[PDB]
Symmetry: D2
Subunit: 486 residues, 4 copies
Amino acid sequence: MESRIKDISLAEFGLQDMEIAKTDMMGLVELQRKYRDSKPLKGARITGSLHLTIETSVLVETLYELGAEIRWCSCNIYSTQDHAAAALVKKNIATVFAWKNETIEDYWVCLNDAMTWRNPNDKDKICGPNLIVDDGGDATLILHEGVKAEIEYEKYNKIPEYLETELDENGKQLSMDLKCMYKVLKMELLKNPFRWRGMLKDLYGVSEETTTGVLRLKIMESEGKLLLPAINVNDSVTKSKFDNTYGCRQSLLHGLFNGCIQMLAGKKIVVLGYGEVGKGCAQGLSGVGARVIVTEIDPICALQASMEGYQVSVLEDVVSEADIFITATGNKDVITVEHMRKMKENAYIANIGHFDDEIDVYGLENYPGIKVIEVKQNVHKFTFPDTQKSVILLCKGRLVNLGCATGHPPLVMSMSFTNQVLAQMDLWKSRETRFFVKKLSKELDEYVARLHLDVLGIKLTKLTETQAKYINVSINGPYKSEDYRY
Amino acid sequence: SNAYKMESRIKDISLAEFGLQDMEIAKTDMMGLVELQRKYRDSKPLKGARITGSLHLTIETSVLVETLYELGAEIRWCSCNIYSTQDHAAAALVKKNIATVFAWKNETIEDYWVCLNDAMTWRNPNDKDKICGPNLIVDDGGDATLILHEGVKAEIEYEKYNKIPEYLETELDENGKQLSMDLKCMYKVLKMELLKNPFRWRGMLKDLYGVSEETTTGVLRLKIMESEGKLLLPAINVNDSVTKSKFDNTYGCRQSLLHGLFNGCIQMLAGKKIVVLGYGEVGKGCAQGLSGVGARVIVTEIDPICALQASMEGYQVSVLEDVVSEADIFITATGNKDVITVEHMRKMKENAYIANIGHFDDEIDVYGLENYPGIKVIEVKQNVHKFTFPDTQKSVILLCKGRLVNLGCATGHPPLVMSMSFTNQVLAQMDLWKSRETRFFVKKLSKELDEYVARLHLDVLGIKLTKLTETQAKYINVSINGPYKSEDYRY
Amino acid sequence: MESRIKDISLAEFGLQDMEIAKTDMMGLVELQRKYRDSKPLKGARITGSLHLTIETSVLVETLYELGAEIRWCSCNIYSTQDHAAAALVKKNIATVFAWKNETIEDYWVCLNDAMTWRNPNDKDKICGPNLIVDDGGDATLILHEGVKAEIEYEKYNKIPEYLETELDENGKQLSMDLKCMYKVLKMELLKNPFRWRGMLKDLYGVSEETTTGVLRLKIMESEGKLLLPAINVNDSVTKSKFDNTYGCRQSLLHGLFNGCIQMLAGKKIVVLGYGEVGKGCAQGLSGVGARVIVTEIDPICALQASMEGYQVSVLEDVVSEADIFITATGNKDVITVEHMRKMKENAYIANIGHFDDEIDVYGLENYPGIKVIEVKQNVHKFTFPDTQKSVILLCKGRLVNLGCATGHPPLVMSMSFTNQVLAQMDLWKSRNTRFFVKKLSKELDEYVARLHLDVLGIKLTKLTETQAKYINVSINGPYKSEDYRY
Amino acid sequence: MESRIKDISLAEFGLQDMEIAKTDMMGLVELQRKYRDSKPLKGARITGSLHLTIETSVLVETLYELGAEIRWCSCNIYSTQDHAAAALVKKNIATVFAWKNETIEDYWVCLNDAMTWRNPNDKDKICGPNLIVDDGGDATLILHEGVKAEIEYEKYNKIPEYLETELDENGKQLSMDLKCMYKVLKMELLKNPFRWRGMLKDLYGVSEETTTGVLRLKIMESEGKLLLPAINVNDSVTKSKFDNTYGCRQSLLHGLFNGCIQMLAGKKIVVLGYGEVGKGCAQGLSGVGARVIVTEIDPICALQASMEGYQVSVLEDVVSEADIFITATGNKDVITVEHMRKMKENAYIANIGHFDDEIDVYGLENYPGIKVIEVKQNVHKFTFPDTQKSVILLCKGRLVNLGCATGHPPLVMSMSFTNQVLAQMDLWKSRETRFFVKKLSKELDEYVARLHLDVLGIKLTKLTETQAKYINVSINGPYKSEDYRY
Ligand SMILES: NC(=O)c1ccc[n+]([C@@H]2O[C@H](COP(=O)([O-])OP(=O)(O)OC[C@H]3O[C@@H](n4cnc5c(N)ncnc54)[C@H](O)[C@@H]3O)[C@@H](O)[C@H]2O)c1
Ligand SMILES: NC(=O)c1ccc[n+]([C@@H]2O[C@H](COP(=O)([O-])OP(=O)(O)OC[C@H]3O[C@@H](n4cnc5c(N)ncnc54)[C@H](O)[C@@H]3O)[C@@H](O)[C@H]2O)c1
């Protein structure tokens, strides 16, 4: 037994949930039906760092049926669905390092173990994955920081001091994620100081699932420091305009209904950030009678919010009157402890963005004399000692739809994961320096949509030759120019 | 040892702190109940009243019980559904000695009727702890009221021939059909009580001052009794208060239907053809919520007025038979029975979801589905079962065994609307108690009190109410303080 | 010959609209088909005071095909559709005294003429109508004030001084409508002081269309001054829950679109009054992106607004911030000159209630130093002298959906007018010092709904005997108890 | 050089609406404030072909205040607002050739005159514009076809026979628009065969307002036949995501309420095309209770429609049951004569796309034995002689919001038109061979949004340095990458 999971006996519930889920994941069902025998990913070692849900287990199953060997971990300490994880282990579909309620330390150990492969020749030698499926950039981060650490290690033939200290370049305390990651890097430098650089040779790419992960990729790219090809799956139209928006419209409500006992109707609920995710959040909240107040830094998004009937305000002007706060920025320090101190009694705070630092959870937990009580497994009420007023935080500020619920439903995830399988296949067939972040073709993007039309009984109109020539498109697409915004 | 802890029958007393914490959080929005406790906890208008409740024991209900308790009443409680009890809510009441409780999540139908009977059984410490009944009843669906009346009928039959009437000892009804399990289990209790004391039910009537009924289905049962001249005690209809029916039934379900569906049905609602059978107060809310998350709602209705209302909101109105093969999810919201038959179920597409939000499980023919020759059943997750027909090999997925899905698969309506319903309940209980000092009929609370309920909740939401000038008040012919609408106003 | 309209040449444009409108007015089509042979209203003299729109023409046609003789006028100086009035006169369906943009003086003269019938036996003598169709209660008001005036006239053998003065009580100037009505009453007393009382024996009742008219009836009943039977048509479920709400949802917008050039999306629109009309107005405004703010006196209605996501405030707390103000209360002095002076530049003010005194128009027009410029017909900008700021009034405060637009569409008016025909037939069929106000039975209310199901392709489900017994109703209905609110 | 409009006495009504409109057009108001002294467009001859509405008059005034000489015409025969055209002529800020209800021949004559300028040196000699503001691409089309005509004329020393023929290649009858354009071009070849080619020299560019015009530009570019620089205004975020969507949401409803007497609630309304325009149309229709059914060729757009709860079907499966049909495709022959013959009695047909050929109006009008009645101004009922069934067409299939109503409101037009002015200034500045189509920068696109925030009381949030660096943007924008879809 190499996998490290919660409980293998939950396998059958997972397997059963996978089959029910699969009814609507027609994109993944079709890729399996079309490629299970030809196996286009045969020989590929794939490491995944992505919320291990039932939907994800179907993604993993799909990659496995296309011939890949798979190792997997979750990209969040609270998102793993333990029955989903056990289904993959029992069936020998993948080697898994993930469980619900991981410590930060265990998060980084699991990611590192998922990145570790034993060479098919001899078990003595370690090697890396050929491909990476990433959500948030953590697997991509540990690889680049691993390489940087090794280069610093050789340069002075000793452990770089930045890995043996609790402080950053400016004397401040390092985040728990960096301390735990640096601890893993130091350990690996002593076991093998060419571990990370040795992987670069066999690494053919990474396919990134989400906006926060993409931003990280784009930053590396513009600095000329990206060390492998990358496909941006987030910005496929069938991902960003469906998963991000429609997926959150349902999964935000599910997370809120599970964690927040109150009625949303008539409540002033602040949605911080009105991008693809924020738009979905507001639509769902209004659907159940909430009066949505939006905050934005972008004047275009602000205007869009206003066109849908929502008030647009700065947090300071509403922090004392609003009832519920939802961060959807992908930024950091959007809700501070100071903001929290001004909120009304039993105001709720939740985050749906990828990382928990949108909310100053650290400042809240380390506030002098603060009291905390567990409302439920993942809901905590914090009471400030000076005012005696309390705020209620959902799942310690981690993405609420996956921390307090089961994330987006199968339909949109099938669309997102169909893009993932296609991105992986593209990277694999192109396998062989300035590396780029590219997106999938519009042809494939439309194809993903075509694969899901029958789920919903959608009947598509077909162009005539005359109409096609008139609007200047092929009868079979693509139907829009590259800059079309949908 | 504590009498409340020992006498109560719940699942786990250790969950009490979670219950108490939830109750405190809920109180932020349950301003109606918070105010009644503040205003009356000293003078205790319900002092000495023995109240028996039969209403889903949720956190919201625990605050209701706490309110009756702070007003001076002794209390015993049970839920009105085998799956709706929230064990932490029940534990909270037992640990604080607020009430003697007989309720847990996932009861059997036998246990359900034994808990109700026990909730109706009191002892008088001033009369050598001898058996008696409650003074007041809080009912949701009319089961407390049913056992009382069937209890009186049973005793009247028993007394004629000095023996147990044979309709209690038989597993079949008047038409030779197999009795529902609820009737069998209720008759079993009635038979046992006739042997303990054949003057038990009629003996309670002396001290019973009324029942206050929470929902549409329980009210229907009351009106049927009243029109037949068989209602044995005064009743207050709480469901038809404006601050109950226009809020709990509609806006409560808008949220709680979705929560139940999200927990039981893993699939995305967006784009699905979802049938909502019944477009009354509950259906209106279900529809609004469903389309709020992208579903395409199709309505079935028997009332041409309601059907037209659905159509005005952009919904297709169809007969079930015309969409039973194409629709993805079916939600019954009628309060009727046999709305979705086994025969309808056999025609549904593969993996169609079926759920009910009405009070009783018989809206969907669950019994006929479970007892269909050769049917195959597997438990997907908690209270979610897939049934497979042997002749077609097609499957349908039933949520909560047909039981009201918002309470059985989720936590029911949220605190805010429940406070509005429960403020009406406390007012009704007080009205019946102060009144203690053809024959019996059903009545509703006055509009003054109905408007009062709403006033108590305006600050929760930062609502600012405009005030009429004398000139305006005289012009529209109302008092500055209300009521602001005539009795027939529909809101 | 005896009709007074603007132009009879428009008739053809009215007759075409009537036929098109009849596609959706199935209730009226059905009553015509079913009762035109037997003619249940045969010999009845019907006077109508109801906005003479295309829809009203179909109502009047239906009363005519059913054997009635008819005289009609509009219940508002701006609501008449000239092509509709022409159609009725051209085909000799009714005698009409109505045109768009009447003066208030002519309004009362037109009404008084509509009430004046000639005795079929001896036409040299006057008589009144047998039945009245009323909207707002003006026909009912002139009858009752006329009777009061005649009685007062006899006690002192002279014109009562209240009819000749023009202040009354507080010394405040009397409304133009009362002065013009009193002028007509004075003129009729001098010609025949038994005119009004002479109509009482043969008057079999009035059927009242709207909330404001019903309110006036209820006041008369509580004081024991109601002089004839009345049917409250507004409170049929198929009128109040459809016309008041869904009719306004479309016609308000249409009225706002013709008079207000500005975009509604993003604007803070205050809807004063959240009753059957207010609910519909809000729904329509939200539908095109406006942020609706509600004002209410009734806490129940205020809570309903909150449950639909609308902020509920008092006018004084938003009068300076809001962009548009829509009164829908059926009350008076809701928007005062003092409120208007605090409004922002080019703020729009409109009314959808029956009467124009919801907004203090008289006070605005007669403000010292006020400047007024007509932007277009029925749209005026008023500029205050001190601040130099302006407000824009639609329709001189008259119901904006009928004054600036064509009112509710055919479908809902058919439901309302099907109730009217049924009411007229009930009062005629039934032909005592005390008279009361009653409503149609729920059987007939449900019948109105049944007649319109085929329009929209609605398929109704039918109860089995065991279900009908279980829910305690008859298979053919009624399906709800009398206190059911729908 | 003397204007041709309907009636100059309407001037004050236009000038009055202009000032009221300016309240929301803060983009154009700002450009006037900032650049009226320096006049960056001084000396520039600007010819515009764009619906001459009140909104357009503020655009022309802005262009004038920036120093340009201006001559203008509408891009549709029914969209001109005569009072708007009058205001421009009265204020003498532009030479105008436009009026409501033009003939097709007049349209091309007006456009050709708008393209004709008297040489800055001589009064006898003719020249062309320096810049073109176009909507639909007709100004751009006449120029390119004018050049082709001249080149073909010199090639064989004769009038090209395609200009004289009434049919074209496939034997089908040429559209009236083509026959009229060709007649104008034929005549210009005789007066001066180097007219069009003479213009290319002084033409610095065209700025195209809409999707259909852009498509035409992209086709010419791909073929390497574009003869001047071009700026695609349609695809600025502040145009396509506001004008096309939220503009139509209000203006479609305005057009339908004016042309269609029926209630939209409950009706099955088919929206053909679910792009930027269709999205808005559907939302506005749903908002008034309609049951929207969508037709699409694009599987992504079709899925999006399904995610909003709309049924997605092919026209043939609903053509007999639907009540109202709205084309929003920018394609042609979307609704054929055969489809119209299958529609139910009194079905309504309207188009909101740029050209009238989305619906086969020509075929309908010229159908053998077709009866047609004018229901009202710009609304016609057509009855087929075989079935005796009727269909009702709004403004002869021309864009319904501008034909049956007053187009989009000022707010969105200011956003669209602020982009036009910015583009014209860009083209004019660059004057100091393959031509391409470019779009404005995201800096300017966001700037357009900023200019309109105060209208709606929008409070923008400002990024901190730490936040700015974390998400890798400047504190002052741009805040999104180029491919961001909003
Ligand atoms: N789950 C909850 O929390 C909750 C909340 C409130 C009420 N309820 C229950 O919900 C049920 C409905 O309550 P309501 O207040 O909406 O009652 P209602 O009378 O307002 O609505 C029921 C509707 O069902 C329609 N109907 C009846 N039989 C039908 C059939 N065979 N097909 C189609 N339509 C049919 C009726 O015309 C009616 O409009 C009741 O059982 C009530 O006790 C449950
Ligand atoms: N324009 C139309 O086509 C049309 C259609 C139907 C009714 N009406 C008219 O519209 C008016 C309202 O009709 P309704 O059916 O909605 O009546 P309603 O009683 O249902 O609604 C009126 C609401 O206004 C509120 N109100 C009263 N005074 C107020 C004040 N000073 N400030 C704030 N709120 C106040 C009341 O609480 C009430 O809820 C009446 O005059 C009626 O005749 C017009």
